[PDB]
């Protein structure tokens, strides 16, 4: 088999999975109602760019690996467009990553900040900078101011796109920063799930232990110390908690009634009051947990969701762009074989097509809507 | 006197200093034919943007300080437009600095790359960049999501333009990046002189010595050893650089001096080598004339850049340095009213005196400014 026939056969397959995997998501949003929220409009817009990446961009990238006699400013257009469409995916994916940062770390402000209005404008900002970075060489910064005769060059990417443009401008800004942002967004969401866990479990253990002491502590002032450490832990739990505000005002009250029952000879009532506030028997503690729980198990999901996206985004775009930097800074030294460099192109067009499907299939509601269309409309 | 009455007074004074000095720069380039090159097209293009700053941006950046009752997207439009205008003064100053980087370190490809079509193009890139950045808040990244009633905010800058836009985005990319680039441009040009200076003052001295040897050089083959060093030095000088014609004859004359030196020393070596002394050496004399011309030409374009960078950092730093302090440390100590407003005036001063000082350092500009005065006056 040829070296070009294999590239095109594989490269055209990704274009199919591009359109297929992203219209199914574009199908599940148009059908299921509980998926039409703000977060998933970005998935609609990312899949919309991904379909433009599959329909229009991948054929324009195969066009570039041929190198036929064509005019400069025309062959420049082809390379600018595949740049434009590959800018849109990395930018729309960045919007989903930042949206998850808002609804998870700043939840009491998510409604009045990410409405349907600015979400329609955030995507409009992504596509505007895609056409700004994209159509930059067309306005001068290209490589034909001065084989096929006059006016016609070999239509390859490195021939019409300046390599310093790809090194200094395109990579450093449209792949590096978008990755270092989704990195910092994943990290601060990951770390947020780690701080909420350690303080809840430690507060918890102090409550059960102290109530365990008090119940089994007697003939000493240990009860006074145990109530003090219980009060402090309930307040630390109040600082993080926001139902939960009302219930915490009452837990503080029950510790005071506990301290008022610990005050005058009512040592058994102080033990009863520790039983009032002991986990098993407190309506407010149990309510406090399920909140502090539900957020943990939910945003650890959206943490691993980002861990998979960043782990896939860095994995796909860097090989193509790292090879670029060696060609510009180290052109005397060694290259990569003729097959390994085209794979760096294949991987680039993978992240731009299989990203909206991974985070979709990781959510249980998208996983149930997909099955309802495959069994019904497909068959 | 008022703290606001002096603000608009000082601001309007700067608005005129923009108008005159840069129309003067454009008055000069339109007169002299030899000023109509490609680099001074970037100086006119920059001088044109600084005229717009004093005509539109300064009247807009004052209305922004009043904090008057107006709809948000009306104060946004006044606030995004001042971000589009100051944008193009730093991106056109960047184009001058990039142009001066090419002409100095890569001169054998300057005219074949920086045509009037791509200079018409590069400037368009700088301007299309500004709209793509300045009109980001108008596309959503503003402040009126959720005094004067409903829908109308106190038309201040920080009331319509976010601060994560003016730190995470507008400073990181439109003050820090443009300034650090022109810093590296100055750095690579400043180091270009020391390397073109050394290897020549090396080649020249290696050449002076061996012939000064050859003059008082003894009988025997020691004269032949000295010629071998001169040939290698002449090859090094030919490597680092009409002109290429004079070296092949020079290399030809050293080989002409070589065979004669291989056989009879006393008489054969003296004629050719003595005419390789600067006096009877036409090709060395043409060669030294070029290096003397190029060396102190790029240093006056290196000091011209240390000034362009120094003036640029002296003004666009105090504004965005305070922007970062109010964004990453809003609780801690503030800069007072006048000092924060001074930083606004600073960032507006560079926008009216930056093409000037650079153009005024050009000697062809300096005569064209005095010819305008005597004719007008
Ligand atoms: C969000 C941003 N979006 C993008 O960046 C998108 O733009 C595309 N792209 C981005 N850099 C691209 C890029 N660098 C060029 C790079 C390279 C070339 C080929 C394959 C991978 C990378 C290169 C390396 C070495 C020399 C020149 C360029 N070469 C291409 C693109 O088509 N090559 C297909 C057609 N070329 C070719 O047959 N060359 C042959 C290969 C062998 N000889 C080599 C190797 C070493 C030295 C000299 N000769 C040169 C001729 N495409 C790119 C890509 O599809 C991205 O998705
Ligand atoms: C391509 C780059 N282009 C540019 O950067 C241009 O855009 C303009 N600009 C860029 N950041 C700007 C910027 N930050 C706001 C910053 C500041 C404010 C005033 C003066 C200098 C800097 C600030 C600091 C602290 C608090 C809020 C904002 N404030 C203004 C601009 O007009 N203030 C005039 C109208 N506001 C005001 O009276 N507030 C008062 C100031 C005093 N109280 C303070 C200070 C501390 C704490 C509380 N209260 C707040 C209200 N203008 C800017 C400026 O004209 C630049 O030339």
Residue numbers in the entry:
A (entry chain B): 3 to 148, 158 to 208, 1001 to 1045, 1060 to 1106, 219 to 308
B (entry chain A): 3 to 148, 158 to 208, 1001 to 1044, 1060 to 1106, 219 to 307
Reported in the publication:
The adenosine A2A receptor (A2AAR) is a prototypical member of the class A subfamily of G-protein-coupled receptors (GPCRs) that is widely distributed in various tissues and organs of the human body, and participates in many important signal-regulation processes. Abnormal function of A2AAR has been linked to neurodegenerative diseases such as Parkinson’s disease, Huntington’s disease, inflammation and coronary heart disease. The signal transduction is accomplished through binding of its agonist in the extracellular pocket that triggers conformational changes of the 7TM, which in turn creates enough space in the intracellular region to accommodate G protein binding. Using A2A adenosine receptor (A2AAR) as an example, we have functionally validated six mutations with increased basal activity (i.e. constitutive active mutations) and 15 mutations with decreased or abolished activity (i.e. constitutive inactive mutations).
In this study we determined the A2AAR constitutive active mutant I923.40N in complex with the agonist UK-432097 to a resolution of 3.8 Å. All mutations were made based on a previous crystallized A2AAR construct with the third intracellular loop (ICL3) replaced with BRIL [referred to as wild type (WT) A2AAR hereafter, unless further mentioned]. We then tried co-crystallization with another agonist, UK-432097, which has similar potency to CGS21680 and was the first agonist that crystallized with WT A2AAR. We successfully crystallized mutants I923.40N and L953.43A with UK-432097 but could only optimize the crystals of I923.40N to a suitable size, and collected the data to 3.8 Å. One asymmetric unit contains two molecules and these two are identical in the conformational state, herein we only refer to molecule A as the densities in molecule A are clearly better than in the other molecule. The I923.40N–UK-432097 structure is similar overall to a previous intermediate A2AAR structure with a Cα r.m.s.d. of 0.46 Å, and is distinct from the inactive (Cα r.m.s.d. of 1.74 Å) or active (Cα r.m.s.d. of 1.61 Å) state structure. Similar to our previous prediction, in the variant structure, Asn923.40 forms a hydrogen bond with Trp2466.48 [Figs. 2(a) and 2(b)]; such a hydrophilic interaction can also be suggested by the continued electronic densities between the two residues [Fig. 2(c)]. Meanwhile, the side chain of Asn923.40 also forms a weak hydrogen bond with the carbonyl group of Cys1855.46, as well as an even weaker interaction with the side chain of Asn2807.45.
